[PDB]
Structure formats: structure tokens, C-alpha cells
Design a protein around this ligand. Structure first.
Ligand SMILES: [Br-]
Ligand SMILES: [Br-]
Ligand SMILES: [Cl-]
Ligand SMILES: [Cl-]
Ligand SMILES: [Cl-]
Ligand SMILES: [Cl-]
Ligand SMILES: [Cl-]
Ligand SMILES: [Cl-]
Lengths: 215, 218
């Protein structure tokens, strides 16, 4: 908590000029959003990847704009579910996989905040989310099995764009770039949760000893 | 209306491939409309119908066919659909009617894909028809910037929302030297749902009706 405020404060320090800021989703991002009151004069435009964050930003007086109206994001700040030694991530375990990935895609710089528990040497212990067109769900699950993954439909979840989620277990993702590409080619896959083709630019990590290391 | 006669001939000929009890998948568009009319004569072999669009589903129901969700159907034995362009290698451009996503899913789940066209669709090089791409609406501007970087001119298709709730960018002025590579590259763009190049999984058979009112099989 004090740790979260510290990691979020570190991230906020990257806001040094007038920018279009993009904001992610999750619990450490919550602390970032509170800290943004100290950078209001530099936050020209805010884009959000999730309803929760948007509610929180609006409560502090920030106007949140649609990405199509904002144009390019200068700086996107978000958490992750897993991070490896090359700033490649698994994200999407919560809400908003597709919105988060679009925001990262449109961002000049992506800062990812994590704690050390999420740091791994190989991605895959945390299940990989994949957003899929509903009509293709079973077809895609079958192709995922051929890759060695165990797909599990995420019950009672419909995404912002009317799709469903398969959470994929049992993968040892030693080549995130190649698996991300492969999953992209499966017909009916909208988005997958590997962020490797466009990895984080900076990772701020809160350590077991409650200090901050910037990678 | 000669073109319509050609379309009917191609469709009729394709329906002759329904020779046993099957799960049939149905495409979308004007040529497929004539196929759907012909299906009444094959009603007893069509155990399950999967549809690539709510448009086709309306037409199927008007003729008393039940339509089943692909997840329940499993695999399609035979999928029959049209195309906006078809080259010499049975690679296609599709999505002029905005149903490319469900179409491509049906092709992916099908054992055999027959493409039905009149000769106006046949080209030596793909690229004479703007390339449709279904995109997540929030990503529209981002993807358009990426398409420009690739050398194309993205045009939002006005007044069109797909069955999946997304929008269409038609990409003009983009050469397709290497269809499988370009299909792969467009799939990498965040927010792209599907692109209209059908080359990674091409048609198995193309039935083309020509002006003499003859058939050509590829
Ligand atoms: Br693993
Ligand atoms: Br040509
Ligand atoms: Cl947005
Ligand atoms: Cl499933
Ligand atoms: Cl049922
Ligand atoms: Cl179409
Ligand atoms: Cl646009
Ligand atoms: Cl190629």
C-alpha cells in the first residue's frame, strides 16, 4: 500500500511535459490515479482502458476521452499479471484485455508497474487470456490444444466488444514473441494477453524489501 | 442480369457437391443467395446448417431451414461462399458485404471450402478490389495510421456495423505482392479482428461461371 504509492509515484515522475496520458486498470494503477492530481498541469488529455479507472479519474476532475479523439498516447501506465526478464508480459487477467492492448499499441512509451511476485524467468504460470469471437470459441479451443495449452472458458464474462475469454493454462512460453504471433493468426482470435511484440519500455518493480527498482 | 444468370449457374453447380448427409456451412452475398434458393432441393442431406451472417440466416429461415451455432455443430463438412476477387491460386479477397469474420471462421472450421464466382471476380493478381478489414471500433484511428505506414489508404465504411458489433476499414491502393505474408502482417495489428485476404487457408475448389454461360472449375 505504502509500497504501491511508492511504485506509482515513481511512475508518475515520468510525466515531465504536456502529454496525452493513458491509464490502465487494476490496484496499483489506483494509487497512480490519486497521484495524478500533482501533475494536472501536464495532463492535456487522458485515455482510459477501463470503466473502473474512468470512474476514478472522473471523480478527481479528469476528463477522459476516447482514443480515436485523442490520437497517439505519449505515455501509458499499467500493471501486469506476469513479467519476464525481457519486459514481456502476460496481461488481461482482469478486465479490459483488448482495450489495454490497443492503448499500449497506440502509446509512444509504456511503463508497467509490478511487484516482485509477478516477476518470472519464463511466462505461463499465470493463465494466458485470449479474447475470441463467440462463434469461434470451440474451434479456437481446439487449436489451442494443438499448441499444448489447456483452454478454459471464463464464465459469465462478456467483454466490451461482445466477445468471450478463454484462459489458457499449462503453457511454458519460452518464446513469447513467436507464440503471440501464432495466436494472432488463429481465426476468430481478437486479442491475446502476451505483450511481447510491443513489450513494456520500462518496468517499475516493488521488491520484497519494499524498495523500487526501475528496469 | 446476365451476371445474375452466371451467379445462379455457379451456385447450382456447387450444390451438386451435396452428395451425402452433411453439416453444411453457408456464405454471404448475392451469389450465395442463389445457392440458398437451390438448397431446398437438397433438404434431406443437410442435417445441420451453419451460417456466416445474420443476412444469410434470414434467407435460410425464409425457406424453412434451421440454423445452428458453430459451437454446437462442431466441424463443417462443406462450406460454400462467394468472393470479391479470386486469383489463380484460389486465394481470395472477401468482405465486400461486411461478413468476412464469420466467413473466415467457417472456412477455418470446414473440411472443404467451395468458392462460387462469376468471371468478373477472377483476376491474375489480387488487389483490384479494396481490402476490407474488420476492426475494434476504439482502435479505428490507430489501425488507419498503421495502414498508412504500410502504404495503403484506409477508408472507414460509413453506416456499417458488422454482426459482431465492429466497423470496417476498406484499404485502397495497397499492392498485394505476397498474399500470405500480408494476411499475416495485418493479423499482427492490434485491434484487427480479421482481414479480407483468404490465402493462409485458400479455397479448395473454385467454381466459376463464364459468359458463354459455361462452367470452369479451378
Ligand atoms: Br511454465
Ligand atoms: Br489482375
Ligand atoms: Cl477509448
Ligand atoms: Cl471452450
Ligand atoms: Cl442446440
Ligand atoms: Cl462479405
Ligand atoms: Cl478512420
Ligand atoms: Cl505470399
Amino acid at each position: 500500500d505504502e509500497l504501491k504509492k511508492l511504485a506509482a509515484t515513481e511512475a508518475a515522475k515520468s510525466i515531465t511535459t504536456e502529454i496525452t496520458l493513458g491509464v490502465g486498470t487494476g490496484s496499483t494503477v489506483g494509487f497512480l490515479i490519486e497521484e495524478l492530481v500533482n501533475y494536472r498541469d501536464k495532463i492535456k488529455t487522458v485515455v482510459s482502458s477501463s470503466e473502473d479507472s474512468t470512474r476514478k479519474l472522473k471523480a478527481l476532475g479528469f476528463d477522459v476521452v476516447d482514443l480515436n479523439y485523442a490520437g497517439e498516447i505519449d505515455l501509458y501506465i499499467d500493471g501486469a499479471d506476469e513479467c519476464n526478464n525481457h519486459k514481456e508480459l502476460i496481461k488481461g487477467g482482469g478486465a479490459a484485455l483488448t482495450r489495454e492492448k490497443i492503448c499500449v499499441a497506440a502509446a509512444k512509451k509504456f511503463i508497467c508497474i509490478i511487484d516482485e511476485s509477478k516477476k518470472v524467468n519464463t511466462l505461463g504460470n499465470f493463465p494466458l487470456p485470449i479474447e475470441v469471437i463467440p462463434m469461434a470459441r470451440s474451434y479456437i479451443a481446439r487449436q489451442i490444444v494443438k499448441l499444448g495449452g489447456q483452454p478454459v472458458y471464463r464464465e459469465q464474462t462478456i467483454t466490451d466488444n461482445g466477445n468471450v475469454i478463454l484462459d489458457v493454462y499449462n503453457l511454458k512460453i519460452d518464446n513469447p514473441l513467436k507464440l503471440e504471433t501464432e495466436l494472432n493468426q488463429i481465426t476468430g482470435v481478437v486479442t491475446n494477453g502476451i505483450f511481447a511484440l510491443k513489450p513494456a519500455d520500462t518496468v517499475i518493480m516493488a521488491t520484497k524489501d519494499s524498495n523500487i527498482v526501475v528496469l
